[PDB]
Amino acid sequence: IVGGYTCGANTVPYQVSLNSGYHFCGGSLINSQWVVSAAHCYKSGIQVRLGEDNINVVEGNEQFISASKSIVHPSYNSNTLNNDIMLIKLKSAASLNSRVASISLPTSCASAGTQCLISGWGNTKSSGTSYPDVLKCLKAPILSDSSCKSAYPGQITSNMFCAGYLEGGKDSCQGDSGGPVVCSGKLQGIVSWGSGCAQKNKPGVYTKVCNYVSWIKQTIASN
Numbered sequence: 001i002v003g004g005y006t007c008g009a010n011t012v013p014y015q016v017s018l019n020s021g022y023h024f025c026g027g028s029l030i031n032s033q034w035v036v037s038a039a040h041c042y043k044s045g046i047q048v049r050l051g052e053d054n055i056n057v058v059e060g061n062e063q064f065i066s067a068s069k070s071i072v073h074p075s076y077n078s079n080t081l082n083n084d085i086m087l088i089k090l091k092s093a094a095s096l097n098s099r100v101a102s103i104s105l106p107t108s109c110a111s112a113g114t115q116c117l118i119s120g121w122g123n124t125k126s127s128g129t130s131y132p133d134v135l136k137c138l139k140a141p142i143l144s145d146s147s148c149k150s151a152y153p154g155q156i157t158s159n160m161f162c163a164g165y166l167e168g169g170k171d172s173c174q175g176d177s178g179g180p181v182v183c184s185g186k187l188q189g190i191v192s193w194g195s196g197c198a199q200k201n202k203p204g205v206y207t208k209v210c211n212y213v214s215w216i217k218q219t220i221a222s223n
């Protein structure tokens with residue numbers, strides 16, 4: 001997260017870290033058994049880390065649970081990042097508590113200008129590299145479809161939206177991918193892609209979760 005702030009320990013209790021010997025992506029707990037993340041975060045052998053603040057220090061509220069299965073969206077296209085969404089099942093159910101909590105799926109898509117919370121452990125610099133150990137947060141509005149498509153002509157599908165600031169300076173970044181964009185209590189986005197981070201007229205692009213609720217519900221009900 002570039003241009004954000006320290007969230008506060010366990011203030012984003014649906015945020016998870018995907019770990020394969022090291023943190024590599026975020027995700028969102030959507031019920032005690034299931035995490036949603038980005039398809040481009042897929043790999044085998046994921047350990048889901050819940051209840052995290054400092055990902056380099058055991059602070060006492062963590063749950064470490066291996067994934068039993070990963071399901072990439074059937075239409076995920078890594079060339080275009082269309083349908084950049086993936087479900088991960090936990091080998092054992094998470095123990096839900098004030099610090100480990102699920103986030104609701106949207107019943108409907110959200111308006112341009114709606115304020116959202118974006119979070120993750122990714123790079124905090126728009127030029128160069130600095131990774132935080134504690135969770136970082138950003139408040140950012142959904143941008144108009146036309147602003148989004150003007151920034152990224154020929155690249156934005158109906159399954160993507162932009163959020164952030166066309167002036168740059170505040171954005172998601174490498175290492176935030178797969179993590180949440182939450183607006184009015186609903187998981188509206190997944191950190192997906194952009195042109196660098198916090199660049200002018202290049203806001204972050206997010207998977208439009210409202211288009212995937214039927215697939216999420218059907219997939220978890222059969223797996």
Ligand SMILES: Nc1ccc(CNC(=O)[C@@H]2CCCN2C(=O)[C@H](N)Cc2ccccc2)cn1
Pocket residue numbers: 040078081171172173174175177191192193194195196197203204205
């Ligand atoms: N707002 C944002 C969000 C994320 C980022 C950092 N990530 C990227 O710039 C691109 C797009 C997302 C994936 N990625 C990578 O470079 C991958 N390491 C390889 C890959 C490339 C393309 C498709 C799949 C995989 C920057 N700004």
Ligand SMILES: [Ca+2]
Pocket residue numbers: 052053054055056057058059062
């Ligand atoms: Ca920790």
